[PDB]
């Protein structure tokens, strides 16, 4: 569909994997990278766009163990949602207060 697992770069145990996301760019890539690097269990995280003219984003996650790159990705997405929710709530409160 939208998220794609690059099976030719994924570890057998799942500790390392590479993901391809369509119709994405630096906007989501850098946010996901920042929110995933905060995971104490991930060893390597980075985003790369193969070609600028194409709408594809690549995410690399390498965990230290006891987890999965997919699990790290899910945790990063959840934490990004929580960060967006808290900034929205604080902005709403400041708008109301003024």
């Amino acid at each position: 569909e939208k998220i794609k697992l690059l099976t030719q770069a994924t570890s057998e145990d799942g500790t390392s994997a590479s993901f391809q996301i369509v119709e994405e760019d630096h906007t989501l890539g850098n946010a996901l990278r920042y929110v995933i690097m905060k995971n104490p269990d991930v060893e390597f995280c980075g985003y790369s766009i193969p070609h600028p003219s194409e709408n594809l984003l690549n995410i690399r996650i390498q965990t230290y163990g006891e987890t999965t790159a997919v699990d790290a990705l899910q945790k990063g997405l959840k934490d990004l949602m929580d960060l967006c929710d808290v900034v929205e709530s604080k902005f709403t409160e400041k708008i109301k207060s003024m």
């Binding site: 998220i3 993901f19 760019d25 850098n30 946010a31 960060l83 929710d85 900034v87 929205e88 400041k94």
Partner: protein
Amino acid sequence: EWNVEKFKKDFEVNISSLDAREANFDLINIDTSIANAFRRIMISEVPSVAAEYVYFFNNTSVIQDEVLAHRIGLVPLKVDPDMLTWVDSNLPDDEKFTDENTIVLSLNVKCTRNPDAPKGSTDPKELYNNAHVYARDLKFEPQGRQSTTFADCPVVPADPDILLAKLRPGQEISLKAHCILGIGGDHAKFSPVSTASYRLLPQINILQPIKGESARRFQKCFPPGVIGIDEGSDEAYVKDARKDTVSREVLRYEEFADKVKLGRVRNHFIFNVESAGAMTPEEIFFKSVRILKNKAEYLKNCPI
């Protein structure tokens, strides 16, 4: 460590101004990767309504049809984007546009000479009738059920005094533009912000004290409201660094090159969102944050 709870504890917003077009607010203790995501989404991801398809019926003016249609497309509209859905492009044009996703404008202006023009006059508004075609002449035509939904809010351009075309007697323009939802990453005519950027809070680190006649010129190297003088001792200090645009005029002087360093506060952003007119800047920022959150949530719910 880092956590959403710690970010909530350390996060603050300082709204400095808020108008119907421009909002100036600060994001404090947030990451550049998130501030930039908000900025990019505001610029080129928040949907808006602008003219896309133009159905010319006659154009005998100097302006060619493609230029006129492009110039019509560039006009911003006072339409709430939530009042209409998105167009499914796969459908044929017979039923691609429905009553709930397209707003149909019209323009029918015909120039004729004014026989009552005063002699020796040069003003085209007295010499001719309809010599100038303005955006306010884009008449909204309600269709279907939207005659009831748009009854309270008419579809008028954000700027009605935009000069769309000029005419001379005998020349007529008769078109019918369809305006739909679109994002600023598709075409720049859809971006709901004039400019929506940010900047790091400037930092002016005074290392050695500057006093006396030297403090006079040190203050002048900045904008007048930034650097002040202490009442007790004739020192120099930073009153408001928000009022400073980094021109590094100090570093041009060897007198003050060794007595102050210029930097930034790397997690203190100063946003400035100017809207085109369709929606308020605070709502634009709300929608950008919600777009980022929904993008993350949709990616999470996508089955890997």
